[PDB]
Amino acid sequence: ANGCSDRGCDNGTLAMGWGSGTADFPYLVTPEQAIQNEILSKGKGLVSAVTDNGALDQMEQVASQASVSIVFVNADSGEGYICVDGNEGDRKNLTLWKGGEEVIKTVAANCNNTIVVMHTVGPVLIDEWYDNPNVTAIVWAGLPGQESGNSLVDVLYGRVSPGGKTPFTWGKTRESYGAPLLTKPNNGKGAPQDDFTEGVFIDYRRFDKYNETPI
Amino acid sequence: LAYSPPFYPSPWMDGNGEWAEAYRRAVDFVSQLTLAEKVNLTTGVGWMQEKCVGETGSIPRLGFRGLCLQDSPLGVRFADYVSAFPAGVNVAATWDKNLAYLRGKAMGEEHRGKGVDVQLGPVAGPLGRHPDGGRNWEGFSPDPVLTGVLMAETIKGIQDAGVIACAKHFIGNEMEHFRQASEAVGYGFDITESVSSNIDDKTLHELYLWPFADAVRAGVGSFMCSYNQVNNSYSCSNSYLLNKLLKSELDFQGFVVSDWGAHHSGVGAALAGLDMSMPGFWGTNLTIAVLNGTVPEWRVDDMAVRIMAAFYKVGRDRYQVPVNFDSWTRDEYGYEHALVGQNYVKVNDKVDVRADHADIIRQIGSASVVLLKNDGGLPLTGYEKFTGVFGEDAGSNRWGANGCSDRGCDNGTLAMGWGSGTADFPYLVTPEQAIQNEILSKGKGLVSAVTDNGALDQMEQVASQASVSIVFVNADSGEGYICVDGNEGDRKNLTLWKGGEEVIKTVAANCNNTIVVMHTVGPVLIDEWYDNPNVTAIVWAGLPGQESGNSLVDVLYGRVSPGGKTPFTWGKTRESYGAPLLTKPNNGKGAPQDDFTEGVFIDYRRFDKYNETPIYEFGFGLSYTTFEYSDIYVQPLNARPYTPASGSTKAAPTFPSGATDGSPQPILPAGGAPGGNPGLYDEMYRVSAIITNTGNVVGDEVPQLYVSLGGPDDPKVVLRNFDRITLHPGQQTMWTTTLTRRDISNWDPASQNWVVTKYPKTVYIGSSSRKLHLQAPLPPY
Amino acid sequence: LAYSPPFYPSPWMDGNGEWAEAYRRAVDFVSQLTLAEKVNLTTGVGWMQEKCVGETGSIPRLGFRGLCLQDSPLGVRFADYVSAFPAGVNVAATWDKNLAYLRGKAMGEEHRGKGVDVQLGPVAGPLGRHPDGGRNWEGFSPDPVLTGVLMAETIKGIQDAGVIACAKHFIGNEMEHFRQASEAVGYGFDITESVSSNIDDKTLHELYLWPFADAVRAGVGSFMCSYNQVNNSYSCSNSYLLNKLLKSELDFQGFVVSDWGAHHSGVGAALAGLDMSMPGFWGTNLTIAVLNGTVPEWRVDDMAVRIMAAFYKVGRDRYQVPVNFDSWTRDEYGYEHALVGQNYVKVNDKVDVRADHADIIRQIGSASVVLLKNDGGLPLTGYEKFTGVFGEDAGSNRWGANGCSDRGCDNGTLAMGWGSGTADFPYLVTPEQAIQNEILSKGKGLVSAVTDNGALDQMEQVASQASVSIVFVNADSGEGYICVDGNEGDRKNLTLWKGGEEVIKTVAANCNNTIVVMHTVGPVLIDEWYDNPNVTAIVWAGLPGQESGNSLVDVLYGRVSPGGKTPFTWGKTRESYGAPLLTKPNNGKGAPQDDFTEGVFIDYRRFDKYNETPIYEFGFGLSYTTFEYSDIYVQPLNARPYTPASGSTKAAPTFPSGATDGSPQPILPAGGAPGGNPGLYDEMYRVSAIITNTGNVVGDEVPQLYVSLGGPDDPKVVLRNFDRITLHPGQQTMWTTTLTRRDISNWDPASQNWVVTKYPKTVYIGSSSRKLHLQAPLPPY
Ligand SMILES: OC[C@H]1NC[C@H](O)[C@@H](O)[C@@H]1O
Ligand SMILES: OC[C@H]1NC[C@H](O)[C@@H](O)[C@@H]1O
Ligand SMILES: [Mg+2]
Ligand SMILES: [Mg+2]
Ligand SMILES: [Mg+2]
Ligand SMILES: [Mg+2]
Ligand SMILES: [Mg+2]
């Protein structure tokens, strides 16, 4: 759980971003673990976890047999002194990491009761899959800390009704958000200038002003 | 070239004793059949042509469907909503007859619930000649008695549940190399024939054949003849093997089925003792050979009656339901060809047969853990401040528990070997999972799992902070048609997989309270770390099936005192075991020759003979309590003198010299009933000793009785009986068993019988093959 | 369902004209044989039983060994000390009859030197219906004329070298998906029969059959019938296909062999036109069928004499030497079973047959380069200050040039596709190697090679500093028994492999003089980068064989001006091509149905019909110089009127309704001679034009003659002729060809003959399918 210094990787379940804004896990309950504990303490149905986003064949064959498919995807970011996968602190895009989008599409193509769980540091572009009819539910779970799997299953299995609201907008495009990120110097060797030209119009204020409909 | 003499005619059933009812009904059935219908029972339908791994032809005129033959020895293969049981080697490590029986019953239940008629197991061949033999883990133990006893219990469990068991593989299939020429060609070898296991008559009787005798006497319905040759005759057309040893001496009443595509002499195989050809030409030729008198009618009558006797013996007439799953797809529906066009039919009903079988699987898991070392490491409490979990073998198969087909990989925790001897997991509880649950339900200390064997920096980091480090390592193997990491079924070495030894050393250098759990199919060379003072405990846990993690923690955290004993030897070197694997053909393009020159001296017998000291001897295991042995007592029973069997068989009924002879035949001196001349099972001595729990916790001991037969060529000791016994602190018990005539005899090739030699015999009772606490002479009479 | 009518009896040889001497000698030989000896010629000895990919039985009484049949279309497969030639698709890109011929001769020389009797090639099926068909690269072009001409030249080359050639696969094997049931099952599909290519009579005649007619007429000794069905009858037992189309209409005189395990109705296949069964179990069944009269004597006789006729036609009697290599091992010696014991025999002589064939392989490599774009990028000088080389496709196969079995991987530079259509490299010169050699022998500027497609930082690093950046990308495919990266033979998409597109974009972002080199088995979608202004040149180089890097740099550095033309279309989308690949069974468990509904409208014909603009049109390619077309002229030749063939065969000699009829048969009106009614090849018009090099360097131009047949359902244009012509600066030539009656005809199903329709025809001469510079009417007469 603490195998990457300052959490500077995206290995396994994402429960914390990277950099100084971190702490060590005393332990980390994964979704895999909590879901298996749930099943095996109740109906004791079948349960298998394919946790390699490259094993698409296995996902097809397990998903075809499933009453329900619970898909996990993430996107990470952190402090600028750490770079992961070409993300220099800031995110180089709003894609799901490690081919998460392909995981969703594969599973959804084989199971008409697919649940998508998103552990992301912020919004990702979901236009391509959110309206898939085979995706019967979608949750965002963020960075839940040490109890991730347990906190999640409490909701998924109905002990707690979900009552969170997204504290940022989910847009169709990166352009929807305006405010492009300055990634190349614009004042020679001197201080770059990030001009806050949009004023108070960030996030939903921007969407509202340009009458753009969020997802 | 070593030679297999002919033996004809192929003996017909007696249907005496426990087989009488079944024979009577088989006869009434076969009497009604055409020749074509009888032949159908003997003929497989074709590879993947129906639902089961093999099916016979049907008899629709009588509303009799073809038999369903399905793998495996540890579960229902190629099926959904089934359980994954511990491997046979785990069963051997329990030394527990009752558990073996109950595992059989539960497996039988699952097969029955799916519509299976024949479960293709259990396994006593391979026995375990080679520590690196790929399929040993499917069986039990290199020891013939341990294997034979648990084989028998397993069979009774399966058949009591209403399914035909199939003792396999008969015989001499002690390695995967060169088992089948086509397979060896796939590996770049140029041979046209399977290897020949060259086994002398004495060695056969006293080692490899022994557990099959137990199988026969346990009432097993079928046998499977092996892919390899024995003395340069393929098992499945080896008249000496099948007609003499199996069907005369051991008086087997059931049917012999071929291994799948096991080469045989077609119609000649039938005359040599084969009853059923799998998987499926033989149909037509058998019909023709009967019609022209090449095969006599009584032979085919006998083939059909054996098959149907097996069917009735286990109550298939009562317990049969439609085959409700498909081996070759998990789809619910599928197209099938019809007389006109096609139909779209139900092919999988997804019938859940698991019942409560997770309990017996957890229990056998716990009972099969062997405590090899404990200098104050175990048990744990669950209140440890910081628990470190280490090794890929702790973690998940990232492709899903069934993500490797036929389990043909070593991803995550190893709970099952590869090949036909498999079943799909309904789920898999990993050690990582079970250990975290244990901590988080108790003291809730720190716990971290580093499950990448390359992440050595992290293991140091974590181990150096841990109150306890629990390290997981494995070694895998399986059937020859699958190669993993250059292990062509057979293991290419006795090393821990994936740098496991490095994981152990790294962790132990950083944590002075290191616990090592080995999930191995067999022995590995541990000389370099077992004696590390920082390794405070070592367990072997084998291949535990679906409840691996849970079964383990029950032992590690002290709910169950470990009571398993190692069913094979842990030597210092590969050379210690002798019997090197033949991995290069030695007969040009012909059948390689694997000569069994060591005789009966495999595993512990070899170590004892050559005075090599094991790291951990056969039969060794520790407990969380202590036991004391006292007061051995030997009572001679004055059994009746042995009488060689004599007289005649009946004439062959209807419902190569001698092959068509249906006249009465002479009984062999060592035959005369299923399992051999009944005088062999006469009790000669009663032997007693007192076992006392001298420790502070309830625990199981496995007392062991060994015999020294006393000759220059005899092993110093051979196991002859054992039991598993629960004792409360301070409680004592008298362990009483008997030695049969067979138990104290040697095979005499000249007289073709078991003899009690004039060499003085000693009996020993102890806690392992080397810890022989008690002894007494066996006084002759 | 689509249906294939019966056509019986199976036509027997005429041995007229060019075949008379071969027929005479075959008769003399077959006259001497027993029936068993005749059947031996027709029967393969079994998979991997002897030395060659296939062998017939022998006739030792006359010292006649079994024939040796050996892959591949581009070299001697499974052999040492041989050359690896460029693939067929490269030959197609040359548009060079002469080069096609010389490649045939060289391959033929090599086969000959090894003792091969039959080279299993070349390929005109797959023709190329699907851009994603896995085996298209083994053939030539989706265009029937281009393929037919070069097919014929290749055949003449092989056979002129004293080896029998084999036109395959006949017919309709346009994809790998579902070609064989067992293979489909291996991929997890549930079917029991091969896909059926459903092709109407007109489409067959005007598209798929056409090149095969060319092969017949070129004197090809053998045909191989395909795995798939045609109109729901397997090619190898399809009487319409073999008896009617091949052996009557096209009057083929040679022998038909099956693809390896290509399914047929056993003895009924022989009646349907099959002559030879590979690889092998029908020998005794054919013998019996002849004895009981189900197969006439004249049929088995005709089978034997066709095989021997092919043998004598290419002069096997003069050129045969013992088979001096082994397909299944590189060992010098090996064991063989004998009447008793074994013989140790020589199995490989390591006969070096490469001669000087590296020269032609280099030359064809260079001639098959197609320059698709050039805005001042090429040629290079070798005096560039800094050359960057980018992409794994520039580098070495790290497992060795032959490190992937049957080239079944995409390691390093792609010079050959995968499957049976392969041969071993004696060496492989990579682009990395050749470019460094070029720089270091000339200007000795800087040069670096980043051959890891994941190393994007380094590519940016180096590309930023480069004078020129040379980027290498590939896309691979092959035979269906091999899957690479989810491509089950056929390509799962038309993307560049291993992120080639990202390499291109990364490099072009940092270097404004980026050259892209594509080694692809067929088209890929390049819409996103081809028009990038930083990409100053684009070349397709295909699968160049052993001299890849050398042949390439010869062009890039201006020693050879590129003159290749793309032999297929480069479209904007996959949908552009129509004819989507069937990758999902559509007839339940039965034969999938592949309907060729687009008719003759494949590749450029489709694009033309829908008025869709390709990125690069069929027949397009640039030069380092410019060419000018002028002054077309059409000369009517006033040919004799077309006469339907009439009269009757002779009766079948000896040495299903109609299947046993040996009586004189009527000649089909479109038959009469090998390749069709001779009147079909009468010259109708002579068409000529002046070509001039108007630039500053020597170059090759490929002028092309297209015809508009003028009907409402005719393609706007079809290729009818072409040549490759070297012109120095300011050099002119008169290019003159003739149009045959076939060239201006349509197939008429009602009359079963080629007809010249009344619609006005127009002839075009141009530099591509879309660059039709000159045109003229074809005056009716
Ligand atoms: O899968 C059927 C059969 N195949 C071959 C194996 O040797 C045998 O154990 C198994 O039962
Ligand atoms: O290798 C033999 C044979 N196998 C099957 C292929 O389709 C054919 O092209 C090849 O010649
Ligand atoms: Mg089926
Ligand atoms: Mg008997
Ligand atoms: Mg050979
Ligand atoms: Mg003719
Ligand atoms: Mg197709």
Automatic annotation (TrEMBL), chains B, C:
Family named by the database record: Belongs to the glycosyl hydrolase 3 family.
Species for this entry: Thermoascus aurantiacus
Broadest EC class assigned to this enzyme: hydrolase
Any single biological process term in GO: cellulose catabolic process
Gene it is expressed from: bgl1
Pfam family, one: Glyco_hydro_3_C
Protein name per its UniProtKB record: beta-glucosidase
EC number: 3.2.1.21
Binding site for Mg(2+) 3: 130, 175, 594
